[model samples]
Target: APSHVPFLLIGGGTAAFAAARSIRARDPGARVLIVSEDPELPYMRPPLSKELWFSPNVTKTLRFKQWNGKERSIYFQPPSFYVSAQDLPHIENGGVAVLTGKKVVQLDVRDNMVKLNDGSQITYEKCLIATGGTPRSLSAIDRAGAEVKSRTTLFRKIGDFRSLEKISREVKSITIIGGGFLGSELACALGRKARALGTEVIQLFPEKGNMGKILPEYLSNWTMEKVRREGVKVMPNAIVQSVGVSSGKLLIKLKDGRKVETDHIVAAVGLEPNVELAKTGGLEIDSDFGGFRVNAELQARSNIWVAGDAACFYDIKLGRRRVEHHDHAVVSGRLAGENMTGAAKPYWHQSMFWSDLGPDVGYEAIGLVDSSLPTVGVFAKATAQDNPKSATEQSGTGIRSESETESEASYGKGVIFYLRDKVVVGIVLWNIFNRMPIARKIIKDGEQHEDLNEVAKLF
Candidate 1:
C-alpha cells in the first residue's frame, strides 16, 4: 500500500525547504513529506563557490557560523530549522517527514502519486516540484580518455567543494572551462587563492570576453583584464577539442592546434533544469528554457506546483521567464506554497541577484540585464574627502594619491540601466549596495527616461 501525504515536496534544495517551511506556517495540521536525493540536509549553495575557496581548511564535516551568527551545519539555516521525522511524532495536529537518499523516478499526476527509485510509492493531495538543476558538461569532455576524466571535476554540490579544497592544496595548476558568472567568479576565487599558494590558474572560454551574456562589452573586457592582472591566464575565444593525460599531467588540445597542460580541470559551463519527472508526468514543459511550465500562480495544473530553477513561470511584467538565483528560489517557493494552500495570489516579486569579484568589484542586478540592450552608465568619482590619504600626506612617498585612486574606482562603479523602447527593463548596480528596492520600484513603475544624469540621481 502506498503511503498518503497531504502535502509532499519533491527535491531538497533551497526552494523545496522554503516551501516546506511556508506550508507548515499556513496549515499547521497539514501533513508534509520531503524527499531528497542528497544525503546532506538542504544547505545554501552560493557559498560553495564563494566562501569555500577562502576557507579550504574547513572540512565537509565542520560547520562554521555564517554572517548571520547562526552556528548551523550549513551556510543558510541550522539543522533545527528543518523538521525531521523524529519531531513529527510529537506534533499535535499534523507532522513533517523527510526521506533522504531517495530519488523520485516517475510521477503519475492523474493518480497524484510519485514512484521512488526504491520501488516505494507516496501519494499526495498536493505536490511541489523543486527538483532544481544539474550542472552541464560538454559531451566531448565527457567522452575524453580515462586519464582526463579522472582529473576533471564539475563545480557544483558539496562533494565538488570537498574535492576542490583537496585539489587546491595539492595541484600546481588548474584549468577552468566556461566564462559566465559562475566560471568567472570561480576563476577569480580559485585564481587568487591558488596563485597565493603557488599554483598557476588558466581559464578558457569560447566567448569573446568573460561574462559576455550578462555584462556589457565594456564591462566584460574590463573584468577580463582585471582577472588577468590578478595572475589568471585568461584564454578567450578558445575551444577545447580534446582532453587527455600526458606524462601524468592533464593535457587539453584546443581547436587552433594549441595545447595546455594542467594538474586539474574544473567545468562551470551551466546548469540544466531537472524536469524529467515533470515531463514523464505529462506536465507542460517550456521548450525554450527546458523547465516545467506554470501559470502566473506557478501552477502546472490543479494541485501541482513548480518553483525554483525547475519552474518556468509567467512573469506579470516580463511575460514568461525562468530565474535561477537564490532570491528567486525563496520568493517563488513562498508564493507557490501560499497558492498551494488556496491563497490564490499571483507571483509579482521581481527578484534581485548579485555577484562579486573579491572585495574590489560587486554588482546587484534586477530584471533582464541583457548585454545586447542599450545601457547607460553613471560613474561617481571619489573626492579627496572620500579617500583617507591626501595629496600632501604622501608627497615624497610613491603611494597612490587621492586622484589616482579615484580613477581606478570611477570607471565601472555605478548604476547601469538597460532600456527597451526608452523604458527601463533592467539595471546593474556595480559596486553599489542597498538600492535593490529602489531598482525594483523603477522596474515596477515602468517609467521611461533617457537622461543618464537624471536616472543617476534616482539611485
Candidate 2:
C-alpha cells in the first residue's frame, strides 16, 4: 500500500463513496485511498434492514426484491469501480481505491498521517473521517453472560443482516428491543417473514409506541398499531431490567417484573458515532450529540474533514446538530469533498430521511420531527392508484380524487406539518411520494403558517 496519497478517507461507507465521486468529478486522476473496517466494500446500509429482508429470493446473492419484483444489489458501485489500494498511487487519471478490513487506530493530524491497527502508517494531503457509527448495546445483554450475548444481535452491517437472515428462519421466536426506525422496521419485516415460518416476533420498547421520539404521540400510537398488524407482538412501555438465560432460550426480564423468552434478540437501540478519532486527531467532540464538531463546511482542521454521522456541523437554521441518515451523509460528504478541492461551499443543504415500517407503511421526514412539536396532519385516503416507494425505491403520486379522501379508517396517506410556535419546522410525508423537494423548501423558507391545510396542498 502507498505510504502517501492525495486523498485519504478513513471509512468505507456512504459518505466515503459520495466524497470519492465528488473528488473524481473535479480532480479526475488524483489517487484516493479509503480505509474501511468492514470486510466488504462500500454498500448501502439501509436496505439490509428494509428491502433485503422482504425479498422473496434473498437466497445466495444479496439483492432487493422491490415492489415491481426487480432485483438490485445494495452496493453503491460494482467491485470493478474501485482499484486496489496498493495500486492507487501508481495509476494515472487518479483512481479511487478501497483498503478493506483495516481499522485506523489513531490519527496524527499534525503529521497528516493515520496509523492502522496492523502497524502501518499512511499519510495524506487531505483526510476525511466518515467512520459513521456502531450500534449501541444494552447493559442488560452485557451482563447476561457470553452464551446469552451470542443470541442477542445488534442489527447494523451486512454481516448482521446475513446472520439474522439465517437465524430468523431457524429460530422459533425473535425478540427485538428498541422502538426507533430500525427496530420497528426490522420487527415488521422479520415479523411478516417469520409468520410463514411460525417464528413468533415480539418488539419491546420504553416508549408508548413506535417512533415516539420522532413522530407525534397520536401518530406514533397509530404507527405502533400498523407494526402490530404485521404479526409482531408490540410491547410498549416495557424496559429491559436484565437479560437471563433459561433452558436453551434467551430470556428477558422487564423493569415491571415481566419475563419473556425467545430464541434470539435484535437490539436496534440507536448508534454512537465513531468519534474515537477525536482522541488522537485533536478534533473537538460534541458531548450531547456524540460527533466530531466541525464547521458548516465540515472541516475539523484546515486539511482534515469530517462528514456523515461522525460530523457535528452547525446548521444556521437549526443550530448545531449531527445527522446520521444517508441523505446527510451524501450531502455532507459531497460538500466536504468540494471544500477539500477549495470550493468554499457552506453546508446549506437540508437532508431528509425516508424510513419504512414495512413495504406499505413508510414516511420521508426533514428537520426536527420531534414528538413534542405541535402537529397538523392533512391526510388523503389511499386509492387504487397510489404508488409504492421511498427514497431508495422510486414510485409516483397518483392525483388525489375527492371521493378517495372520504375514508375515516386511514391516516395512511397524509402530509404532516410539524409546528413550533405556529411556524413550520418539520414536514413528514406519510405514504406520500416524490415530495421531498417541496418539504425542503418549506423548512428552508422557515415560514410561520397559521393554516397548515394550505401547506398540505403544496405537497
Candidate 3:
C-alpha cells in the first residue's frame, strides 16, 4: 500500500506531530504520511522525563498525573485519529497516517521518492526533515561490557521511560549522571519513590550544581540543595571516567579518583541531532549546533523543510540557533508546516520552555536565557505552585522556581531577566504563570529597558 502523499513527515515526535496537525488544519483534504522509526504512536517528550516518572507505574499501564489531578496518556493523538499506514493514499477524504518502526534510508528529490530501510519507497509532494535527535553516546556507559551496559539507560524516549520505571522498583540503588533539568527532575522524582522503596539514589554531574549551565550560580546551588533534601546523594563536579562491573554490581569510577557502585545508571547528558540522512539527502548541516541547515522559513530546499531539534534555522535577532526545547519544536514545526502549505511566514516567534523540579521549583523563560548573560532577578514573598497551563494545555509554557521553605534566600514568584548590552534578550519567569505571551512580546520587541524593575510590574 505504499503510495504518494501530499505531505510527508519524517519523524513521529512533537515537531512532526505538530506539522501534521498544522497541515490538516490548513487543508482538510490533504493526505499526510509520517514515517517514524519509533514503534509506538506519536507522543510528547516532556512527560517522558518529568510527569511520567511521577507515575511511571500507575497500574493501568503508564499514565502521568497532570496538575489538575487527571491521569493522562503520553500519546498525542488517539489511534482513531489516524488512518492505517497502507490505507493512507487510498482514503477518499484524505487523512493522517503513520509508518512506525521504519527508517527512511534515502531521500530523492527529483521525482520525490523516499526509500525506506525495508526496501519500500513512497513519493511525496513536499518533505519535512523532523527526525530530531538521539541521545549522545556516553563512552563511559558504552565502554562497559554487556553486563554493565544493560544496567545503564540513555533516557530520551518512552521506551527508555518504561524500562527505567520498571527498573526503579527492583533496583536497590540508581545513579543518575548529568545535572541538567532532566537529571535534576528525574533524580527528585525517582528519589521520592526510592526513599519509600529503600532504594538509594545517587546523582553525578560535572557541574557544581543542578542546571549550572543554564541557571545562575545561586539558583543552581539552591536547586542542588533541594535535590539533596529529597534524599538523593548528589556528587557535583564529578565526571564519569569509567564504568565497569564488580561482584555483579555496576561500578562507576569518577575522574576525581572517586569510585561508587550502583545497581543502575541513567545518563541524561544531551542529544546529538540525527543528521545522518543529511548526507544522503544532500542537505547542508549547521557547523555550530550540528543540525540540518534551514532558511529563515525553515526550508532546506525548494520542497524540503526542517523543524524541531534537528532544524538549525536563522534567528535573525539572536543570530543562528538550534533550539532543543519543546516550545521550539511546537512553534517551529507549526511554522514549517504553514510554510509548506503557502503561509509564507517568517520564523519570528520566540518559543519558551520550562523545567519544574516536582513542586519545589518551576520556571518559564523566553528567548536566550543563558548563564553568562547579566541577570536581574526580582522576587516576591510567595510559594511556588505547579502551573496548570504547562500540564493541561499545549502552550508550552512551564513554571520553575527556587525552594521557598528551605532556601529562604528567595521567596514568592519572581522574574529573572538575562540582559546583554542593556537589552533584554531572555526572560525567566520563576514561579510565574500565564505570562509567556508578554515574555514573547518583550523578546520580539528587543527594546532596551533602562529601569528593568518597571518591566516586572507590567507582568
Specify the highest-lDDT model's number. 2
Worst 10 residues of 1 by lDDT: 401-410
Model 2: per-residue Cα lDDT over 1-459, one tens digit each: 689999999999989998999998888777889999889889877778776877635655676766546666778888998888878888767699998899999999899999998999998999999999888999888877899888889888888988888888888899999999889889888988988887799999999999888887777898888888888999999989988888987889898998998999999888899998789877889998788998877888999999998888897678889886777888788888888888988988776777766556667777888877778888887654344443334332111111122111214588888788888888877777666777777777777887888878876
TM-score of every candidate:
0.88, 0.93, 0.92
The parts of candidate 3 lying over 4 Å away from their true place are 56-60, 383-412
For every candidate, C-alpha RMSD to the true structure in Å: 7.3, 4.9, 4.7
The candidate that wins on TM-score is 2
Model 1 gets an lDDT of: 0.76
Candidate 1, residue 368: Cα displacement in angstroms equals 1.4
Clashing pairs in 3: 361-401, 362-399, 362-400, 362-401, 363-399, 363-400, 382-412
Error of 1 at 4 (Å): 1.8
Off by over 4 Å in 2: 56-59, 385-410
In candidate 1, stretches whose alpha carbon ends up further than 4 angstroms from where it belongs are 61-76, 81-93, 382-412
